[PDB]
Design a protein around this nucleic acid. Sequence first.
DNA 1: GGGACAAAGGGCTTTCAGAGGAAACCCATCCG
DNA 2: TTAAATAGGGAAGATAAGCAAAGGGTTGACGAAAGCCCTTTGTCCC
Lengths: 301, 248, 67
Amino acid sequence: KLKAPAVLAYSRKINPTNALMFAVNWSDRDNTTAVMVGTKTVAGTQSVRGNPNDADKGNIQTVNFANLPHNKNTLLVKYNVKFVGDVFKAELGGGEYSNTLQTALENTDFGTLAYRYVYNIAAGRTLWRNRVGAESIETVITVNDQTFTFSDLLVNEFDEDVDVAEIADMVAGVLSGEGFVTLKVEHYMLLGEGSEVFPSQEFVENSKLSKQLFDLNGQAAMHDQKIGNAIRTIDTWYEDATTPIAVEPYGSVVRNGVAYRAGNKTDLFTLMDGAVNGKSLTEEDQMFVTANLIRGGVFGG
Amino acid sequence: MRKFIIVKNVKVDGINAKSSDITVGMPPATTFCGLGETMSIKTGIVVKAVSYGSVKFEVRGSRFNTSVTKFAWQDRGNGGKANNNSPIQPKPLADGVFTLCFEVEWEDCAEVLVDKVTNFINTARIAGGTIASFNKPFVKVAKDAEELASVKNAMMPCYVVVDCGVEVNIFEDAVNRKLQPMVNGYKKLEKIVDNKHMRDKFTPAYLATPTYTMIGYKMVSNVDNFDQALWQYGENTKVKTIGGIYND
Amino acid sequence: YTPKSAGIKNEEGENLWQVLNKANMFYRIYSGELGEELQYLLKSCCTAKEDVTTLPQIYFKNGEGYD
DNA sequence: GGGACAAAGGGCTTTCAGAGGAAACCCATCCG
DNA sequence: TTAAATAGGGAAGATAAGCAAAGGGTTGACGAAAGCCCTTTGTCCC
């Protein structure tokens, strides 16, 4: 039957860094200034569903904000991404299960996955709600001493492009066994003067502040997990629900509370131990399994 | 309650922590009373009472199952099998730093006593341990009960043993009253007839078992009467304190 | 104490140390509540045996003198 | 040379017996 | 290189959701009280 081992894990093949935010002009994008956070205190009312008796009371809260200065009208978000190869190599265990899975795999097409990974960065899905309120977004990508500029719209419904292909082919070769490649990504926006930015929030227990924002030495930044989550939102290989989501086992979004790829014979683990046990997978199943194996995770039990 | 001599911060290593079959830790007041008697007989100076305080103490090992010391072949009955790991016969050890107060009756001078005490301490033992270092002794003079507080406070800092007495027995009192037992004397069972293997052929010999009493540990500055913190030999082979049962 | 502590166990399996110390039959026999047949034989075993080799020996003050 | 006793030493040894059990305490002052 | 003289009252501090699974925890050495036999030494007898 060749059951999965008790302990079996894989490493992460796409490494993003913490993005940093700067305030620059649209025509003077050379000199950069950092964005601080600060703290403010606000007053308001109490509007809680099911508590109407305290509707005439006040409310005092302490929050953290972040916004552009009144003389700068462009937000620059910069980060680095690293792609590494040597996929289908189990970090823990695997002498026959991993080899059988690799033999059943690696016949798929890495070109589409490499194209979509680069497109999610070029179109500008990596930067979150900071997108709204902007009329022009410009992306600069540097790799192997070769600069590329993008102004691509329509982040959904991945379309054909010329400059994206000549980086996608480079990434695809590295994915199926090579060393490493590195991309430097910069994003410029036209939010305006004095507009508000949205750095990543952080989990905190009971404290004085009601909302604090992630920062590095006082400068607003973004979590690398959040950056990497938007890159792998390429799962368009299930029955319904277009505008795809991220690739995860039992592909689900906790924000909406719905779990796609539920117990209806389309899961990561069912396909993994069905591929090695005789029957192979389809093209979409192979791309899903390979894409989810590029993502980390532990499988076993 | 006239002349006292203080020796503080005395470091002793390898103290025999086993005082009886059920008490492991601090030596009982009998050990210090015997040390005082040995000092009196060897030096020629009458010593009335002894007081001891525990600055530091630690039994070698862990919370439970203290330790085992390796043994060696030293008897004349072997030679063939005396080559591998002689039996155990367990004997625990500990390390501690103490402070001692001695009641002395001597009026010839003031500085000769310090020298005569320092001479004896350099070659003495505490429950089988070896003395590493100690401070220079000093003498305090008490004329009445009110200034006894000063000589008491001269012993800072340490924890002194006070006597609280036994109610029923040590086993029930320890669980209920939350105190620790201690050996205060020996009870004779039956006389030794054959005097061949004994260390002395003139002193009468007896078989004795320890008698247990419950004690407590108190800070020096919190002692009400200093006479409750001094121990001396009593009647019927017992060691008792001047102040009797300690009461707050 | 008996050499090698061998003895013979009961049908359920008990030695004398467990039997006499289970529910205080020792005092039930020492007093003589079970008769005078099991009273003399048990008391015959209560004999002293002196042995001082490898034992501690300490001097204690007893009035004027030492013991 | 043979018999008995004791001591010392070694070895042939070897005889003898046997599964409970659960967890971090005591305690704040003299002296320069 | 200054004397004194006081330093505000009132209201009020949000809510909801969730904290992962799998694998392993070492071995060796620390006996007393005899039974028998042999050898040696020493004493005594024949």
